[PDB]
Amino acid sequence: SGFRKMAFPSGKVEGCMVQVICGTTTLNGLWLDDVVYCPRHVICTSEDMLNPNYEDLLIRKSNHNFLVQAGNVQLRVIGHSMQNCVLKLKVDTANPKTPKYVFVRIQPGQTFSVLACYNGSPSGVYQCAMRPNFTIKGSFLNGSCGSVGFNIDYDCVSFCYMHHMVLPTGVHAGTDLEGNFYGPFVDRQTAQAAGTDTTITVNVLAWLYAAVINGDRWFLNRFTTTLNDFNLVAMKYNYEPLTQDHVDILGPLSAQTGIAVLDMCASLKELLQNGMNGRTILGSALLEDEFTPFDVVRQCSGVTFQ
Amino acid sequence: SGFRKMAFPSGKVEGCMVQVICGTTTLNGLWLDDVVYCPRHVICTSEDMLNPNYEDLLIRKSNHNFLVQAGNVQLRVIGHSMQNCVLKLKVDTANPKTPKYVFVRIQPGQTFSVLACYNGSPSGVYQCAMRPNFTIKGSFLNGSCGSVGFNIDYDCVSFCYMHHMVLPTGVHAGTDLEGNFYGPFVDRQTAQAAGTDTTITVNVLAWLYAAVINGDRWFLNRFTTTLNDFNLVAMKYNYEPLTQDHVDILGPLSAQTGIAVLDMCASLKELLQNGMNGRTILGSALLEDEFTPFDVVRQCSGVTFQ
Ligand SMILES: *C(=N)[C@H](C[C@@H]1CCNC1=O)NC(=O)[C@@H]1[C@@H]2[C@H](CN1C(=O)[C@@H](NC(=O)C(F)(F)F)C(C)(C)C)C2(C)C
Ligand SMILES: *C(=N)[C@H](C[C@@H]1CCNC1=O)NC(=O)[C@@H]1[C@@H]2[C@H](CN1C(=O)[C@@H](NC(=O)C(F)(F)F)C(C)(C)C)C2(C)C
């Protein structure tokens, strides 16, 4: 009963967050085994960030130029290297709370939880999606860089995002844990802008299935459609094409509700053409595209994690 | 930059969740010091829940009728007592991960995070508000009872909610940690219904301040109003009266944005009378009332917790 934007429990990630200080700049780091991962612009001054040469700036720093704070314990940095846009600091102590973990790169349309942190301390948790233009609609303030995005699979934390910057229009950009940016952005304070966004069509349909599961079923019609006919209508409204892979992804929701994917596509097509006529779906006046089909299954079937 | 429904980090609460089994019924429990708190209907069968006599059912059970599972460790129950609608189980081992904590009863309009759990394992976290009709719009499945709501103050976990039931229209009802229900509901499977809900007016204004902070300021007009004039309009739209205490609560947001509370009240009054004219605020087509003024300050100023 009910449906909300639900984040993964964050305790496993909380035990990995540390504060990284380089001179006067401070931000968050991820402590896994004996390595701390953090954005490379921790080594920049405010002036440096306008046009930085990270390799040149890292040259002039030794291990003693970095201070890592984990709770009330300072960790000695005994090595450092740069991998793309993330800095890796080897420390003399391995994190005893290191969970089983993996570094992944997610695709546009997939969701993850964000643990927003400041000065190495967790502050809040929320759910986000990687937009088709490779931004995320996050909530970050100054000092939030180093905050990570993740998904939990039973006992394994899949880290997929580290926060680096906010763009015009207030959207956010970052890297995977190997330091490669999502999208064409660079970690320099210069004018950059994301491309036009798109509505994640498969996520809307998953959200529509969630509405039916919770008894909100006014938008269901008696029609069907073909994948070609639906996609032609969707493109005119800046909706992404629905592929056969997306249909297969939606299979579990079709089986639970007894509504064929193409029948639900007929309902969405009507909603796109005629609007919602002043009605709401799951309490929302706009169609929602930041729930993946697995999010709907997990929330409407109750998968737990240890 | 940006604004989301943000939950508190849940790690402190995750270390307190256990599985409570009584015969065939299973649900979640809260393990603090050497006591486990859980809903009292764990001692019911499916038939019992239709019209239970909890005192009579508890009579016929000893400490050995309860099995508490904390991870891979079973805890021996060495005592049990009933306090209102919560059952308290004394165990032979105190929780070493017991955080500093307090039991509070919240007021309608205040928010809290929910750690949804099943079989004692955390599954997801989301933010909720206590509605004026003393329900919450949660997301719960079968076996979710014992899940708790909480707020974090630095290092202290303030527990304010334990989940017990879902009502018609899909809203949820529960108790404080002393077992007293929020609202007139009872833990019996019989037809019950919540009163008419109301829009938390002070929370809407706080959310409007969050919009201005994030540059979304089309709804600001050049007018002011009196508290009496605004409240008269608000009542016709099922909005709660705005008191002087609510105005004082809003003070920090007025100081940060430089917009007087009554000037923002003039904007809300116009929105209520004329609608939104097809526009959105913070990406929403409806006014949002589940952010308290402190939530806005915390998210737009970045308070952390250890
Ligand atoms: C990390 N601690 C911050 C988080 C920012 C700060 C406010 N909201 C956020 O998400 N990251 C930065 O300050 C990054 C970083 C330099 C500058 N920066 C920016 O986000 C800037 N944005 C851009 O330059 C633009 F236009 F490309 F988006 C800023 C103007 C300061 C908001 C580096 C190294 C890119
Ligand atoms: C705790 N594990 C469950 C959580 C429920 C189950 C589905 N969604 C939820 O939130 N709590 C219950 O099953 C409680 C509990 C008996 C029955 N119950 C209900 O929520 C029932 N609701 C009502 O009887 C009514 F109308 F008052 F809301 C049910 C019809 C089973 C949904 C007790 C002891 C009240």
Q: In CATH, what number is assigned to the domain containing residue B47?
A: 2.40.10.10
| Shortest Cα–Cα distance, A214 to chain B (Å) | 8
A122 forms beta bridges with: A117
Q: How far is residue A171's CA from residue A140's CA, in Å, rounded to a whole number?
A: 10
Q: How far is residue A181's CA from residue A194's CA, in Å, rounded to a whole number?
A: 13
Has residue A105 been placed in a domain? no
B116 forms beta bridges with: B124
Has residue A188 been placed in a domain? no
Has residue B73 been placed in a domain? yes
CATH of the domain at B251: 1.10.1840.10
Q: Is B164 among the residues known to form the active site?
A: no
Beta strands in A154-258 (DSSP E): 156-166, 172-175
B20 forms beta bridges with: B27, B68
Has residue A212 been placed in a domain? yes
Resolution of the coordinates in A? 2.2
Has residue B54 been placed in a domain? yes
Q: How far is residue B16's CA from residue B35's CA, in Å, rounded to a whole number?
A: 11
Answer for the pair B127, B113: CB distance below 8 angstroms, yes or no.
yes
Split into its structural domains, chain A has a count of: 2
Answer for the pair A159, A8: CB distance below 8 angstroms, yes or no.
no
Has residue B108 been placed in a domain? no
Solved by what technique? X-ray
Count of Cβ atoms closer than 10 Å to residue B142 Cβ: 10
Q: Token pair 């409240």 is at which residue?
A: B231
If you measure CA to CA, which chain B residue comes closest to A153?
B123
Q: Cα A194 from chain centroid?
A: 16
| Angle formed by the axes of helices A293-301 and A201-213, nearest 10° | 20
Parent domain of A283? 201-301
Has residue B32 been placed in a domain? yes
- 3-state SS, chain B, equals CCCCCCECCCHHHHCCEEEEEECCEEEEEEEECCEEEEEHHHHCCCCHHHCCCHHHHHHCCCHHHEEEEECCEEECEEEEEEECCEEEEEECCCCCCCCCEEECCCCCCCEEEEEEEECCEEEEEEEEECCCCCCECCCCCCCCCCCEEEEEECCEEEEEEEEEEECHHHCEEEECCCCCECCCCCCCCCCCCCCCCCECHHHHHHHHHHHHHCCCCCCCCCCCCCHHHHHHHHHHCCECCCCHHHHHHCHHHHHHHCCCHHHHHHHHHHHHHHCCCCCCECCECCCCCCCCHHHHHHHHHCCCCC
Count of Cβ atoms closer than 10 Å to residue B129 Cβ: 21
Cα end-to-end span (Å), chain B: 23
| Rg of chain B over all Cα atoms, to the nearest angstrom | 22
Has residue B217 been placed in a domain? yes
Q: Is A217 left (phi over 0), alpha (psi -120 to 50) or beta?
A: alpha
Q: How far is residue B136's CA from residue B161's CA, in Å, rounded to a whole number?
A: 10
Q: Is A41 among the residues known to form the active site?
A: yes
Closest listed residue to residue A87, CA positions, set A189, A178, A184, A187:
A178
By the 10 Å C-beta count (0-12 exposed, 13-18 middle, 19+ buried), A127 is classed as buried
| Of the residues A69, A91, A113, the one at which a domain ends | A91
Q: Token pair 């697995």 is at which residue?
A: A294
Which one of B85, B128, B145, B160 is the catalytic residue? Answer: B145
Expressed in angstroms and rounded, the spacing between residue A283 Cα and the centre of ligand 2 is 22
Closest listed residue to residue A65, CA positions, set A55, A51, A53, A79:
A79
Q: How many residues does chain A have?
A: 306
Give residue B156's identity as a one-letter amino acid code: C
Q: How far is residue A100's CA from residue A105's CA, in Å, rounded to a whole number?
A: 17
Which one of A128, A145, A160, A265 is the catalytic residue? Answer: A145
Expressed in angstroms and rounded, the spacing between residue A152 Cα and the centre of ligand 2 is 28
Q: How far is residue B120's CA from residue A158's CA, in Å, rounded to a whole number?
A: 22
Closest listed residue to residue A229, CA positions, set A259, A266, A201:
A266
What are the φ and ψ backbone dihedral angles of B12, each rounded to 5 degrees? -60, -35
Answer for the pair A141, A125: CB distance below 8 angstroms, yes or no.
no
Give the helix/strand (H/E) hosting A242: none
Sequence-ordered list of residues with C-beta below 8 angstroms from that of A166, at least 6 positions apart, any chain: A138, A140, A172, A173, B1, B2
Expressed in angstroms and rounded, the spacing between residue A244 Cα and the centre of ligand 1 is 38
DSSP A240: P
Chain A residues with CB-CB distance to B166 below 8 A = 1-2
Count of Cβ atoms closer than 10 Å to residue A188 Cβ: 16
| Of the residues A55, A74, A91, the one at which a domain ends | A91
Which one of A16, A22, A41, A128 is the catalytic residue? Answer: A41
By the 10 Å C-beta count (0-12 exposed, 13-18 middle, 19+ buried), A154 is classed as exposed
Chain B residues with CB-CB distance to A291 below 8 A = none
Q: How far is residue A231's CA from residue A235's CA, in Å, rounded to a whole number?
A: 6
Beta strands in chain A (DSSP E): 17-22, 25-32, 35-39, 66-70, 73-75, 77-83, 86-91, 101-103, 111-118, 121-129, 148-153, 156-166, 172-175
Sequence-ordered list of residues with C-beta below 8 angstroms from that of B49, at least 6 positions apart, any chain: B41, B188, B189
3-class secondary structure, A31: strand
Give residue B155's identity as a one-letter amino acid code: D
Answer for the pair B221, B270: CB distance below 8 angstroms, yes or no.
yes
Q: Token pair 């032979």 is at which residue?
A: B92
Give Dmax (Cα) for chain B: 69
Our answer on whether the CB atom of B142 is closer than 6 Å to any ligand 2 atom is yes
| Of the residues A38, A58, A91, the one at which a domain ends | A91
* B11 to A284: CB separation less than 8 angstroms, yes or no: no
Kindly report the protein residue whose alpha carbon is nearest to atom 21 of ligand 1. A189
Q: How many residues does chain B have?
A: 306
CA distance readout (Å), A96 to A70, A100, A152: 12, 11, 19
Q: How far is residue A290's CA from residue A205's CA, in Å, rounded to a whole number?
A: 11
By the 10 Å C-beta count (0-12 exposed, 13-18 middle, 19+ buried), B164 is classed as buried
